[PDB]
Amino acid sequence: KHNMKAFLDELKAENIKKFLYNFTQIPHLAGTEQNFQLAKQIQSQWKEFGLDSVELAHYDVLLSYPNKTHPNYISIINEDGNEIFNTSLFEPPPPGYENVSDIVPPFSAFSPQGMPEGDLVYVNYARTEDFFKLERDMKINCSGKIVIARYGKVFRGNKVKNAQLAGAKGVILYSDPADYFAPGVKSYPDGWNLPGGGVQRGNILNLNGAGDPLTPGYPANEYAYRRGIAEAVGLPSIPVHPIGYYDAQKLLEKMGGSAPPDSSWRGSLKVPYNVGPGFTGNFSTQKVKMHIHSTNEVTRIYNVIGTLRGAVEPDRYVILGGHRDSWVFGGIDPQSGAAVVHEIVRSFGTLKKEGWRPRRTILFASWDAEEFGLLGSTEWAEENSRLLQERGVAYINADSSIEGNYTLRVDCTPLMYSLVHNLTKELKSPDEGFEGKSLYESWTKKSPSPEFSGMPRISKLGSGNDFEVFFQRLGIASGRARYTKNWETNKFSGYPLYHSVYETYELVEKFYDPMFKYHLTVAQVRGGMVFELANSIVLPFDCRDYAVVLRKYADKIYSISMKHPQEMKTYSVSFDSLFSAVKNFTEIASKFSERLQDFSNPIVLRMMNDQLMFLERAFIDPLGLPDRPFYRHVIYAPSSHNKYAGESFPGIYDALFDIESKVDPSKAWGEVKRQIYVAAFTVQAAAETLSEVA
Amino acid sequence: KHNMKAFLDELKAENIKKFLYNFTQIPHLAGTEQNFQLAKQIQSQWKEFGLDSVELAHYDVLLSYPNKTHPNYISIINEDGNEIFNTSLFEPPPPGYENVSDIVPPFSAFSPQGMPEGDLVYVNYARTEDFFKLERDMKINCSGKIVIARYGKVFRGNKVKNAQLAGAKGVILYSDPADYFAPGVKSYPDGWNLPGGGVQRGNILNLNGAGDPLTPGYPANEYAYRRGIAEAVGLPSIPVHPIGYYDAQKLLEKMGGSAPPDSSWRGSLKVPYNVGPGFTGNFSTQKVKMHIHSTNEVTRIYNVIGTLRGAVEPDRYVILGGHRDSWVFGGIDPQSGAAVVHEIVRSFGTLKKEGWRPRRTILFASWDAEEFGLLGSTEWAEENSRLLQERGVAYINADSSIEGNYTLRVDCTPLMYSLVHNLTKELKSPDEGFEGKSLYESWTKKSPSPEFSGMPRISKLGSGNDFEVFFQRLGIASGRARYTKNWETNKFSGYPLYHSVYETYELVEKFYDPMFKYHLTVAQVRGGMVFELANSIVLPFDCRDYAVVLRKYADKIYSISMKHPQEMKTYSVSFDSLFSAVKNFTEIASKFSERLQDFSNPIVLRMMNDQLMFLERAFIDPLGLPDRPFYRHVIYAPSSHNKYAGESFPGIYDALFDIESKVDPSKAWGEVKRQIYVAAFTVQAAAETLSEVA
Ligand SMILES: *[C@@H]1O[C@H](CO)[C@@H](O[C@@H]2O[C@H](CO)[C@@H](O[C@@H]3O[C@H](CO)[C@@H](O)[C@H](O[C@H]4O[C@H](CO)[C@@H](O)[C@H](O)[C@@H]4O)[C@@H]3O)[C@H](O)[C@H]2NC(C)=O)[C@H](O)[C@H]1NC(C)=O
Ligand SMILES: *[C@@H]1O[C@H](CO)[C@@H](O[C@@H]2O[C@H](CO)[C@@H](O[C@@H]3O[C@H](CO)[C@@H](O)[C@H](O[C@H]4O[C@H](CO)[C@@H](O)[C@H](O)[C@@H]4O)[C@@H]3O)[C@H](O)[C@H]2NC(C)=O)[C@H](O)[C@H]1NC(C)=O
Ligand SMILES: *[C@@H]1O[C@H](CO)[C@@H](O[C@@H]2O[C@H](CO)[C@@H](O[C@@H]3O[C@H](CO)[C@@H](O)[C@H](O)[C@@H]3O)[C@H](O)[C@H]2NC(C)=O)[C@H](O)[C@H]1NC(C)=O
Ligand SMILES: *[C@@H]1O[C@H](CO)[C@@H](O[C@@H]2O[C@H](CO)[C@@H](O[C@@H]3O[C@H](CO)[C@@H](O)[C@H](O)[C@@H]3O)[C@H](O)[C@H]2NC(C)=O)[C@H](O)[C@H]1NC(C)=O
Ligand SMILES: *[C@@H]1O[C@H](CO[C@@H]2O[C@@H](C)[C@@H](O)[C@@H](O)[C@@H]2O)[C@@H](O[C@@H]2O[C@H](CO)[C@@H](O)[C@H](O)[C@H]2NC(C)=O)[C@H](O)[C@H]1NC(C)=O
Ligand SMILES: *[C@@H]1O[C@H](CO[C@@H]2O[C@@H](C)[C@@H](O)[C@@H](O)[C@@H]2O)[C@@H](O[C@@H]2O[C@H](CO)[C@@H](O)[C@H](O)[C@H]2NC(C)=O)[C@H](O)[C@H]1NC(C)=O
Ligand SMILES: C#CC[C@H](NC(=O)N[C@@H](CCCCNC(=O)c1ccc(I)cc1)C(=O)O)C(=O)O
Ligand SMILES: C#CC[C@H](NC(=O)N[C@@H](CCCCNC(=O)c1ccc(I)cc1)C(=O)O)C(=O)O
Ligand SMILES: *[C@@H]1O[C@H](CO)[C@@H](O[C@@H]2O[C@H](CO)[C@@H](O)[C@H](O)[C@H]2NC(C)=O)[C@H](O)[C@H]1NC(C)=O
Ligand SMILES: *[C@@H]1O[C@H](CO)[C@@H](O[C@@H]2O[C@H](CO)[C@@H](O)[C@H](O)[C@H]2NC(C)=O)[C@H](O)[C@H]1NC(C)=O
Ligand SMILES: *[C@@H]1O[C@H](CO[C@@H]2O[C@@H](C)[C@@H](O)[C@@H](O)[C@@H]2O)[C@@H](O)[C@H](O)[C@H]1NC(C)=O
Ligand SMILES: *[C@@H]1O[C@H](CO[C@@H]2O[C@@H](C)[C@@H](O)[C@@H](O)[C@@H]2O)[C@@H](O)[C@H](O)[C@H]1NC(C)=O
Ligand SMILES: *[C@@H]1O[C@H](CO)[C@@H](O)[C@H](O)[C@H]1NC(C)=O
Ligand SMILES: *[C@@H]1O[C@H](CO)[C@@H](O)[C@H](O)[C@H]1NC(C)=O
Ligand SMILES: *[C@@H]1O[C@H](CO)[C@@H](O)[C@H](O)[C@H]1NC(C)=O
Ligand SMILES: *[C@@H]1O[C@H](CO)[C@@H](O)[C@H](O)[C@H]1NC(C)=O
Ligand SMILES: [Ca+2]
Ligand SMILES: [Ca+2]
Ligand SMILES: [Cl-]
Ligand SMILES: [Cl-]
Ligand SMILES: [Zn+2]
Ligand SMILES: [Zn+2]
Ligand SMILES: [Zn+2]
Ligand SMILES: [Zn+2]
C-alpha cells in the first residue's frame, strides 16, 4: 500500500542526523558563495530523490554586511576622547572551529552607519509598555540618548522602532543571562547556555510584510525598478549593535540617574539596572560611543523549488517550505528544519519511484535570505502571486525543528486544527514517560489549551518566518510545528544560543536530541500534514473551527473596547454588526459541513474543495490594513508591538490601542467604528462563500 | 433540441416593443418610489419567467437632486445687480406628457451649492488640450472665471475636473447644435434632433471607480461607516449647470476678449465664439451669475438579481447586467437595453420550463443608480467581490441597445473577439441591402478594422457603464454591444436626445427602430454571447487574441516614448522587458491553445477552463494604478482625459503624458521606467498562468 503509514514509516532519524551534519559544517550566510553551493547541492539531491522538476529561482535583493576592514564596536570614551573600554570584535569560536573563516561577526543587519556618542538610558526590553513607563511615569526623556535594551519578549526590530520614535540616537542590544542562561546548565560547549562572549545576530527591520526593501509589490528580478535607499521599506534610521553579557556588564555597571522602577526591570547581572540617563557621579563625564560601518548591498539570493506533480489535481498546490540561509552554522536555525524537509522529500520520492503520486501537486522550497527579513519566500510569492492565490491549498513552514525537548508547539490557521488533532492522535509520543502513548496525549498533558479541557494549545500566526507572505498577504491556509521547551515567559525570546556562533551540529547532537527522535516526530507532523493536505479526497479543513475562534476573538475585542464605556456611549460604538456576522458565519459553516458530509460527483466535490480552499482567501481585504498594505488578512496580523506574535482583529485592535491618549477622541473612535464595519463585513463575506453557490 | 438556435428563435421583436413601452411611461429616477415599484415589477416578472431565485439587493448611497422649491438657474446680471436674463427652469415637455409630474429638471448631479458671479471664459469642449491651448498658447487665465464649455467628445466629469484645476469658480455646460443637431433632420417631436430648449442631464463625478462616494471599498449596507462629505470620493468643488442652445446663445453672443484660436473652436450658433474673458465693450460691466441649490442625500437604491442555476458548473457565473434607473423616461437610455434583457430572461426561462438548464449559472441584473456614477453595480460587486473573483466567468453589459440604426458597435476584452466574430457570422443582418447576409458581413463592411482587412472594429473598455467594476477592478472578462450611427467624431458625445426629457418610447418607435429589428439583433448578440459563455464545454475565450493586441499596445506605447529620444538615452529608458514579456506571452499562449485543442477528462477540462477564466484576472495588480486604487487592470483603464474611452498600458501612458512639462525630468522618467517594469512583470505573470500547471 501507498498510504500515509507507508510515507511516515520511510522517515528515518538516522537520515535526518546525517543531513543535519552535512548542512552545518560551514557557514551558509545569505548572498555568499557557500550558500549558493548548498543550494546547488540540494537541487541535485532533490532531483536524485525523485522530484519531477527542481529549479533555482534567484532575485537581487538588499542585504547588509559588516565591513571586514572597518569593524563595528562600541566604546566608553572619556572627557579627552580616549576610548577606555571596547566591546568585542567577534565571538570566541567554538572548539574545533577556531579556524573556520567567513564567520560573520555579530552585527544588526540593516543598521545605518554612524558614530553617535552620548549618555545611556536603559529601557528594559524596549517594549511599548517599557517606553510608556519611562516617558509617562518616570518622566525620563530618551531624546538624543543612546538606549541600551535587553533582548527578549518581542522582535528586536520592534525595540529599534520604539527607540527611534522615542528620539534615541542609537540602540545597543544585549543578551541578559536572566533571559538567555537557564539556571543549573553549563555554557556552551559544556551545555546549551549562552556564554558571556556569545552574541545574538539578527535583522532589525521595521517589518511590514514587504520583502526586499527596494521592490515592494514586485519580484526583484533582472529588470526590476528599485526604490532609492531613502524611500526603502522598513530600514531603521539610527545605528544599532548587539553585544554579549560580559560587555553589557561593563556598560551597565556605571549607570546612574533613577533606580529601576521595579523588579521586572532587573536582569541577573550584578549591576543596579539604573535607568540613567548617563553614569554615576565620578564617571558623569564619560560617554558611550558607537562605531557602525556596515553596508547595505544588493546581492543575489537563490531559492530551490522542487515539484512533485499531482496525479488528479496538478493545479492545486500544497507547499512545504523552510529556509536554508543561516547567520553562521545554523545547527538549530534553520538546518534542523532543512534536514527534516530533506528527509520528507526523500520519503515522498521513494513512494514516487514505486509508482505513487499524491492527488495534488506538492511544492518543496528551500528559501534564501530568511534571516534578512523573509526575502526569498516573499520575492518568490510576489513573482507567483497569481498562481498561488488561485491554486494554493496550504503552506506548511519548516524552520527549526527543535528549540527544546519538552513538547510540541503549533501555530496554524483554525482551518487546520482538526487535521493537527487527528494526525497527532495517530503518531507515537517520543517523550520519556509516554512510551506507547500518542503524541496528542503527551502534548495535551504538557501544553493544555487555556480554553478547553483535553485539548492542546495552538497559537496564532504573526510574522517572523517564511509563512508570512502566504498567510498574511495571500490568504493561504498555513501552519508550523516544532518541539519546544517548558519556559512560557521566554516563548518569544529564542533558545539561549539563538543566532549565535555556538548553534552547531554538536549543540544539537549532544544536548538537544542525541537520538534524533524529536526531529523524527517533527518530520512526522510536518510531513503527515503535507501528506493529508495533498492526498485527502476532501480537503482536511474544518470551517466550524474558524466559527468557534471568531466568537472568541469578537468577545476579546469587545472586552477591550468596554474598558471605555463613556466613549462607547458618546460615539455610539456598537459591536452588534460583528457579533451578527460571527453568528451568521457559525450558522452557514454548520450547514456547509452537513453538505460536505452528505454528497460520486467530482464537480460537487471540487466545487466544495474550492469553497474550502478559498475560505482562508475570503479573509483578505484587497485594501490591506491601515498603512500596512501587505498585511491583508482581517482576522490576523503580526502584532504592531511584537512581530513574532499574531494579533486577532488587528485593525480594530490597533484603532483601540492607547486610544485614551489620542488628542481627537471623535476621530479616534470614528476609526474604531470604521474597523468594526470592515471586520463585520469581511466575516459576513467569508461566511457567504460557504453558502450554496446558486 | 435545446441549443443556441432554440434560444435565439424564442426572442421576439414584438415582446421587446411591449416591454419598452411598459418601461417608459413614467420617470424612473434613482432613489424615487417609481423606480422601486419598477424594481418590484421586474422581480415578479423574472420569477414568473422561470428564474430559480430573484432578490432585491439594496444599498444606501449618496445621490443628488435639485431643490424643488429653490430652482437652479443662471443669470446675466447688470452693474446694479438686476438679473436681466435667466436660463430656463425646465425643458418644454414632449407632446402628451406635459402633465407628467416628477420630471427632474436639468441639473448636474453632485454639483455643490453656490452663487458664483463672474466673467465668462469659453473653453470649447473643456478637454485637456483645450485648456493647454488657452493657458499655454493664448495666455488666458481661467482663475476666478466662470467657464462655459460645450458638451461632447469627452465625459462631462473630465470637463469639470479640468475647469477646477484651471482655477474656474463655476462651469456652464451646453449642447451646441454642431454636436447635437444632425443636418437635415427635424427637432423632436418631428425628428430625432435636440431642440433649443432641450438639455442633457448627467453626473459630473471625477470618476475613479469607487462607487458610492461615502463608502469606497465596501458595500453601503445598513452598518456601513461613511466618510464625511469633505473626504467623499469624486465630488466636484465648483458649481456646475447644463443648459440648451437657446440659452447658450444668449450667454455667448455678448462674449469679447480674444477670437477663437481656429475653426475647431467654433460650433454652429450664430455667435463669434470669442474666448473672453468677459463681454464686449458695451456690456463689459455685466457678469454671469449661477444659482445652484441642489443637495446631496443618502438614499436607498435597489438592484434586482436573478439566478438561473447551472446544471454542471453552478459555481461558475456568467452575468448579464444593465441598469433600470433613468434621468426621465429612459426611452433609449436605459430602457431599450432593459427591454432586451427582459426578453432574454423570458427566452432562457422558456427553455428552463422545458427542462433545460445552462451548463454554468447565469446571473441577470437590473442595476440601480447607474446614472449617478455606476453606484448599484459597484456596491453589489463590492459586497460579492470574493464570489465574483473566484467564480466570475464573464460580464455582458446591456444598457441602451440602440444609439442609431446604421451598424453594430462592440467593445470587449480581446478574450471575446473570436466569440463575437463567430456569433455574428451566424446571425442575420437586419440592415437594408444585406438581406440574407450575416451580421458579420454588414458590420465588417460598415465598420472596418483599422488594422485588418475583412475584420470589424472592436474597441477597448473604459468606464461610463456598469461593466467598469467587473472589468477594471475585478478582472472579469467583459463585453458590450449595441446598434450605432455613422458619425465617428461624435462617438463619445451621445445621440442628440441623450439624457433629455425627449428620450421617449415615441422617439424609438417613430424614428429609431419602428420594427424593433435592431433591438432584436442586439438581443441575439447579447443573449447569444451569454448562451455560449454559459453553455460551451470549453470557455469560448481565445488567449492568442490577447497576445496579438498586447504587441499592438506595446508598439504604441514605445512610439509615444520615442517622441523623447534624448531623454530615453539620458535615463536609459528601455522597453526591452515589455517586448520580451509580450513575446513570451505569445509563445505560451500558442502552446496553451494547442493543448486546449488536444485533450474525456473533466479535471483537465476544468483545470484548463480555470486557466481561461483566470487569465483576465491575471492582469489585475492588487496595488492598483498610481493614485487610482480601484483601477487595477494593468492593460486597460479608463482614460484620465476621457472616462468613456479606454487607454492601453495606462500606467505607462499617464507617466509619459505631458512629460516634457515636468519640472524634475529625472523623477518623471524614473516613474516611466517603474511603469514599464510593472507592465512587463504583469504580462509575464499572466503568460505564466497559461503554462503547464506542474
Ligand atoms: C446576518 O444574516 C442576516 C440574515 O439572516 C442578515 O439579516 C439582514 O439584516 C439586514 C440589516 O439588519 C436587513 O435589512 C433590512 O432589510 C429590509 C428589507 O428586507 C429593510 O426594509 C430594512 O430597512 C428598514 O429598517 C432599517 C433598520 O431599522 C432602517 O435603517 C431603514 O431605513 C428601513 O426603515 C433593513 O434594510 C435584511 O433584511 C436582513 N436579511 C434577511 C433577514 O434575510 C444580517 O445582515 C447578517 N449580518 C451581517 C453583519 O451581515
Ligand atoms: C521571457 O522568457 C524567457 C525564458 O525563455 C526569460 O528568460 C530569462 O531571462 C532572464 C533575464 O534575462 C535570465 O536571467 C539570467 O539567469 C542566469 C542564470 O540562469 C544568470 O546567470 C544571469 O545573470 C547574469 O547576467 C545578467 C545579465 O547580464 C547580470 O545582470 C547578472 O549580474 C549575471 O551576471 C541572468 O539572471 C534567465 O536565465 C532566463 N530564463 C531562461 C532562459 O530560462 C525572460 O526573463 C522572459 N521575459 C520576462 C520579461 O520575464
Ligand atoms: C478528524 O477525525 C474525526 C473523527 O474521525 C473526523 O470526524 C468524522 O468524520 C466522518 C467523515 O465525515 C464523519 O462521518 C460521517 O458521519 C455522518 C453521520 O453523522 C454520515 O452522514 C456520513 O456518511 C459520515 O459517515 C464523522 O461523524 C466524524 N466524527 C465526528 C466526531 O465529527 C474529522 O473529519 C477528522 N477531521 C479532518 C479529517 O479534518
Ligand atoms: C470560432 O470558430 C472557429 C472556426 O470554427 C473555431 O476554430 C476552430 O476550432 C476547432 C475546435 O478547436 C478546431 O478544430 C480542431 O482542429 C485540430 C486540427 O488542427 C484538431 O487537432 C482538433 O481535434 C480540432 O478538430 C479548428 O481548427 C478551428 N479552426 C480554426 C480556423 O482555427 C474557433 O474555436 C471558434 N472560437 C471560439 C469558439 O471562441
Ligand atoms: C579601543 O579601540 C580603539 C580603536 O582601535 C582601532 O580600531 C579597533 C577596531 C582595532 O582594530 C584597533 O586595532 C584599532 O587601532 C583604540 O584607540 C586607538 O589606539 C591607537 C593606539 O594607541 C591610536 O593610534 C588610535 O588613534 C586610537 N583610535 C581611536 C581613539 O579611535 C583604543 O586604545 C582601544 N581601547 C582599549 C581600552 O583597548
Ligand atoms: C430672473 O429671475 C430673478 C429671480 O426670480 C426668482 O427666482 C426665479 C427662479 C423665479 O422662481 C421667480 O419667480 C423668483 O422671483 C428675477 O429677479 C427677481 O424679481 C422679483 C420681482 O421683480 C424681485 O422681487 C426679486 O427680488 C428678484 N430677485 C433677484 C434679483 O434675485 C428677475 O426679474 C428675472 N429676470 C428676468 C429677465 O426674467
Ligand atoms: C523576520 C525575520 C528573520 C528571523 N526569523 C527568526 O529568527 N525566526 C525564529 C524566531 C525565534 C524566536 C521567537 N519565536 C517565535 O516567534 C515562534 C517559534 C515557533 C513557533 I511553532 C511559533 C513562534 C523562528 O521563527 O524560529 C529573525 O527573527 O531575525
Ligand atoms: C458614469 C456614468 C453614468 C452615465 N453613463 C452613461 O450615460 N453612459 C452612456 C454614455 C453614452 C455617450 C458615450 N458613449 C460611450 O461611452 C460608448 C457607447 C457604446 C459602446 I458598444 C461603447 C462606448 C452609455 O454608455 O451608453 C453618464 O455618462 O452620465
Ligand atoms: C554533503 O553531502 C553532499 C552530497 O553527498 C556532498 O557533496 C558530494 O561530494 C562528493 C565528494 O566530494 C562529490 O563526488 C559529489 O559531487 C557531491 N554531490 C553533490 C554536491 O550533490 C558534500 O561533500 C557533503 N558536505 C559535507 C560538508 O559533508
Ligand atoms: C407594465 O406591465 C406590468 C406587468 O403586466 C403591469 O403591472 C401589472 O398591472 C396589473 C393591472 O394593474 C396588475 O394586476 C398586476 O399586479 C401588475 N403586475 C406586476 C406588477 O407584476 C403594469 O401595469 C404595466 N405598466 C404600464 C405603464 O403599462
Ligand atoms: C570598508 O572599510 C574600508 C577600510 O577603511 C579604512 O580602514 C579602517 C580601519 C578605517 O580607518 C577607515 O577610516 C579607513 O578608510 C574602506 O576602504 C571601504 O570603503 C569600506 N567598504 C565599504 C564601504 O563597502
Ligand atoms: C430647499 O429650498 C427650500 C425653500 O427655500 C426658500 O425659498 C426659495 C425660493 C429661496 O428664497 C430660499 O432662500 C428660501 O429659503 C428650503 O426651505 C429648504 O431648506 C431647501 N431644501 C433642502 C436644502 O434640502
Ligand atoms: C525631550 O528632549 C528634547 C530636548 O532636546 C526636547 O526637544 C523634547 O521636546 C523633549 N520632550 C519632552 C516631552 O520633554
Ligand atoms: C532535554 O531534556 C532533559 C530532561 O528533562 C533536560 O534536563 C535537558 O536539559 C533537555 N535539553 C534541552 C536543550 O532542553
Ligand atoms: C492666474 O490668475 C490669478 C490672478 O488672481 C493668479 O493668482 C494666478 O497665479 C495666475 N496664473 C497665471 C499663470 O497667470
Ligand atoms: C434610420 O436609418 C435611416 C436610413 O439610413 C436614416 O435616414 C434615419 O435617420 C435613421 N434613424 C436614426 C435615428 O438614425
Ligand atoms: Ca519585491
Ligand atoms: Ca461602497
Ligand atoms: Cl517553523
Ligand atoms: Cl451597453
Ligand atoms: Zn530560521
Ligand atoms: Zn533565524
Ligand atoms: Zn445608461
Ligand atoms: Zn445614461
3-class DSSP assignment, residue A382? helix
| Residue with the three cell numbers 510545528 | A481
User: Can you tell me the distance from the alpha carbon of A382 to that of B678, in angstroms, rounded to the nearest whole number?
Assistant: 12
User: Can you tell me the distance from the alpha carbon of B194 to that of A623, in angstroms, rounded to the nearest whole number?
Assistant: 45
Sign of CA dihedral B418, B422, B427, B430: positive
Domain boundary pick from A540, A558, A575: A540
Task: Give the minimum alpha-carbon distance from B84 to chain A in angstroms, rounded to a whole number.
Answer: 48
Q: Residues lining ligand 7, judged by CB closer than 6 Å?
A: A 202-203, 207, 333, 370-371, 373-374, 399-400, 409-411, 464-465, 480-482, 492, 494, 644
Nearest to A117 by CA among A173, A162, A170, A172: A170
Domain boundary pick from B247, B265, B292: B292
| DSSP conformation class of B133 | I
Q: Within its chain, how far is the Cα of B81 from the centroid?
A: 42
SS3 percent helix, strand, coil of chain B, rounded to 5, is 40, 20, 40
Cell of B22: 411598459
According to DSSP, the residues that pair with A290 across neighbouring strands are A74
User: Can you tell me the distance from the alpha carbon of B325 to that of B320, in angstroms, rounded to the nearest whole number?
Assistant: 16
User: Can you tell me the distance from the alpha carbon of B283 to that of B120, in angstroms, rounded to the nearest whole number?
Assistant: 12
- CB-based contact, A606 to chain B, within 8 Å: yes
| Residue with the three cell numbers 517523550 | A431
User: Can you tell me the distance from the alpha carbon of A467 to that of B351, in angstroms, rounded to the nearest whole number?
Assistant: 50
Q: Which helix (H) or strand (E) holds B611?
A: helix B602-618
Looking at the fold, whether A271 and A324 belong to one and the same domain comes out as no
The Cβ-side half-sphere exposure at B320, using a 13 Å CA radius, reads 30
Sign of CA dihedral A579, A583, A586, A588: negative
Nearest to A573 by CA among A648, A655, A486, A685: A655
User: Can you tell me the distance from the alpha carbon of B145 to that of B277, in angstroms, rounded to the nearest whole number?
Assistant: 8
* Residues contributing to the annotated binding site of A for substrate: 156, 203, 370, 463-465, 480-482, 498-499, 643-644
| DSSP conformation class of B659 | G
Q: Are B329 and B23 a contacting pair, CB within 8 Å? A: no
Strands (E), B359-418: 360-367, 392-397, 407-412
Nearest to A494 by CA among A173, A246, A184: A173
Distances (CA, A) of B427 to B424, B454, B528: 5, 17, 9
Looking at the fold, whether A664 and A531 belong to one and the same domain comes out as no
User: Which residues of B form the catalytic set?
Assistant: 370, 574, 610, 633
Burial (Cβ within 10 Å: 0-12, 13-18, ≥19) of residue A228: exposed
Q: Is A531 in the pocket of ligand 5 (CB under 6 A)?
A: no
Residue of A nearest to B623 (CA): A217
Distances (CA, A) of B684 to A170, A188, A221, B589: 44, 51, 12, 11
* Pairing mode, strands A146-150 and A170-174: parallel
3-class DSSP assignment, residue A565? helix
Q: Are A340 and A333 a contacting pair, CB within 8 Å? A: no
User: Can you tell me the distance from the alpha carbon of A388 to that of A392, in angstroms, rounded to the nearest whole number?
Assistant: 5
Q: Are B517 and B337 a contacting pair, CB within 8 Å? A: no
Q: How many other CB atoms are there within 10 angstroms of residue B263's CB atom?
A: 7
Cell of B389: 473573483
User: Can you tell me the distance from the alpha carbon of B545 to that of B417, in angstroms, rounded to the nearest whole number?
Assistant: 7
Cell of A617: 482567501
List helix spans (H) across A245-384.
Answer: 245-252, 335-353, 375-383
Resolution, in Å, please? Answer: 1.6
Number of residues that make up chain B: 694
Looking at the fold, whether A435 and A516 belong to one and the same domain comes out as yes
User: Can you tell me the distance from the alpha carbon of B205 to that of A485, in angstroms, rounded to the nearest whole number?
Assistant: 61
User: Can you tell me the distance from the alpha carbon of B120 to that of B345, in angstroms, rounded to the nearest whole number?
Assistant: 51
Residues 6+ apart with CB under 8 A from A78: A84, A285, A286
Residues 6+ apart with CB under 8 A from A21: A505, A509
Looking at the fold, whether A337 and A383 belong to one and the same domain comes out as yes
Looking at the fold, whether A287 and A390 belong to one and the same domain comes out as no
Sign of CA dihedral B350, B356, B362, B363: positive
Nearest to A418 by CA among A300, A323, A541: A541
| Residue with the three cell numbers 436605459 | B334
Kindly report the backbone phi and psi dihedral angles of residue A414, in degrees, each rounded to the nearest multiple of 5, phi listed first: -50, -25
User: Can you tell me the distance from the alpha carbon of A62 to that of A296, in angstroms, rounded to the nearest whole number?
Assistant: 6
User: Can you tell me the distance from the alpha carbon of A321 to that of B521, in angstroms, rounded to the nearest whole number?
Assistant: 56
Task: Give the minimum alpha-carbon distance from A127 to chain B in angstroms, rounded to a whole number.
Answer: 32
Looking at the fold, whether B474 and B374 belong to one and the same domain comes out as yes
Task: Give the minimum alpha-carbon distance from A645 to chain B in angstroms, rounded to a whole number.
Answer: 26
Looking at the fold, whether B515 and B568 belong to one and the same domain comes out as no
Q: Are A369 and A301 a contacting pair, CB within 8 Å? A: yes
User: Can you tell me the distance from the alpha carbon of B549 to that of B139, in angstroms, rounded to the nearest whole number?
Assistant: 41
Q: Is B22 in the pocket of ligand 10 (CB under 6 A)?
A: yes
Strands (E), A265-341: 287-291, 295-308, 313-323
Q: Which amino acid is at A48?
A: E
Looking at the fold, whether A518 and A467 belong to one and the same domain comes out as yes
Looking at the fold, whether A148 and A273 belong to one and the same domain comes out as yes
Cell of B428: 442575420
CATH code of A207's domain? 3.50.30.30
User: Can you tell me the distance from the alpha carbon of A89 to that of A336, in angstroms, rounded to the nearest whole number?
Assistant: 28
What is the residue range of B498's domain? Answer: 1-66+293-540
Residues 6+ apart with CB under 8 A from A341: A320, A321, A322, A364, A366, A398, A526
Nearest to B209 by CA among B384, B374, B413: B374
According to DSSP, the residues that pair with A620 across neighbouring strands are A633
Ligand 4: residue of B597, B598, B600, B609 to mutate (most ligand atoms within 8 A of CB) is B597
Burial (Cβ within 10 Å: 0-12, 13-18, ≥19) of residue B454: exposed
Q: Are B483 and B409 a contacting pair, CB within 8 Å? A: yes
Looking at the fold, whether B308 and B452 belong to one and the same domain comes out as yes
Cell of B393: 466567468
User: Can you tell me the distance from the alpha carbon of A224 to that of A441, in angstroms, rounded to the nearest whole number?
Assistant: 51
Looking at the fold, whether B126 and B217 belong to one and the same domain comes out as yes
Helix axes A665-688, A576-597, angle to 10 degrees: 10
Nearest to B364 by CA among B408, B389, B397: B397
Strand order in the sheet with B287-291: B83-86, B73-77, B287-291, B117-118
User: Can you tell me the distance from the alpha carbon of B415 to that of B426, in angstroms, rounded to the nearest whole number?
Assistant: 19
Distances (CA, A) of B495 to B210, B250, B294, B459, B517: 27, 24, 27, 18, 19
User: Can you tell me the distance from the alpha carbon of B20 to that of B8, in angstroms, rounded to the nearest whole number?
Assistant: 19
Q: Are A382 and A224 a contacting pair, CB within 8 Å? A: no
Show which of residues 305-344 on chain A sit within 8 Å of chain B, judged by CB atoms.
Answer: 307, 309-310, 312-315, 317
| Residue B295 marked as a ligand binder | no
| Residue with the three cell numbers 543612546 | A146
Number of domains in chain A: 3
For the CA of A406, the nearest atom of ligand 14: 2
R_g of chain B, CA atoms, integer Å: 25
Residues 6+ apart with CB under 8 A from A206: A157, A160, A161, A234, A235, A236
User: Can you tell me the distance from the alpha carbon of A28 to that of A341, in angstroms, rounded to the nearest whole number?
Assistant: 17
Cell of B96: 402628451
Domain boundary pick from A540, A566, A600: A540
Residues 6+ apart with CB under 8 A from B546: B413, B414, B415, B585, B589, B615
Sign of CA dihedral B339, B345, B347, B349: negative
Residues 6+ apart with CB under 8 A from A471: A395, A413, A461, A477, A478, A616, A633, A636
Residues 6+ apart with CB under 8 A from A370: A30, A323, A325, A334, A376, A377, A399, A465, A466
User: Can you tell me the distance from the alpha carbon of A291 to that of A285, in angstroms, rounded to the nearest whole number?
Assistant: 19
Question: Is A315's CB within 8 Å of B618's CB?
Answer: no
User: Can you tell me the distance from the alpha carbon of B89 to that of B107, in angstroms, rounded to the nearest whole number?
Assistant: 10
CATH code of B515's domain? 3.40.630.10
R_g of chain A, CA atoms, integer Å: 25
Q: Are A241 and A83 a contacting pair, CB within 8 Å? A: no
Ligand 9: residue of A18, A19, A41, A54 to mutate (most ligand atoms within 8 A of CB) is A41
Question: Is B315's CB within 8 Å of A693's CB?
Answer: yes
Kindly report the backbone phi and psi dihedral angles of residue A41, in degrees, each rounded to the nearest multiple of 5, phi listed first: -65, -45
Kindly report the backbone phi and psi dihedral angles of residue B325, in degrees, each rounded to the nearest multiple of 5, phi listed first: -70, 145
Sign of CA dihedral B119, B124, B129, B134: negative
Q: Which amino acid is at A519?
A: H
Phi-psi region of B55 (alpha: psi -120 to 50; beta: other; left: phi over 0): beta
User: Can you tell me the distance from the alpha carbon of A105 to that of A209, in angstroms, rounded to the nearest whole number?
Assistant: 27
Q: Which helix (H) or strand (E) holds A38?
A: helix A33-49
User: Can you tell me the distance from the alpha carbon of A325 to that of A299, in angstroms, rounded to the nearest whole number?
Assistant: 14
Question: Is A622's CB within 8 Å of B385's CB?
Answer: yes
Q: Which helix (H) or strand (E) holds A360?
A: strand A360-367
Whether a cis peptide bond, with omega within 30° of 0, leads into A602 is no
Question: Is B603's CB within 8 Å of A602's CB?
Answer: yes
Strand order in the sheet with A360-367: A53-65, A295-308, A360-367, A313-323, A392-397, A477-484, A407-412
Q: Within its chain, how far is the Cα of B384 from the centroid?
A: 22
Looking at the fold, whether B52 and B72 belong to one and the same domain comes out as no
Nearest to A252 by CA among A281, A277, A272, A282: A272
Distances (CA, A) of A610 to A92, A393, A539, A582, B391: 54, 9, 9, 22, 10
Burial call A43-78: b when 16+ CB within 10 Å, e when fewer: bebbeebbbeebeebbbbbbbbbbeeeebbbbbbbe
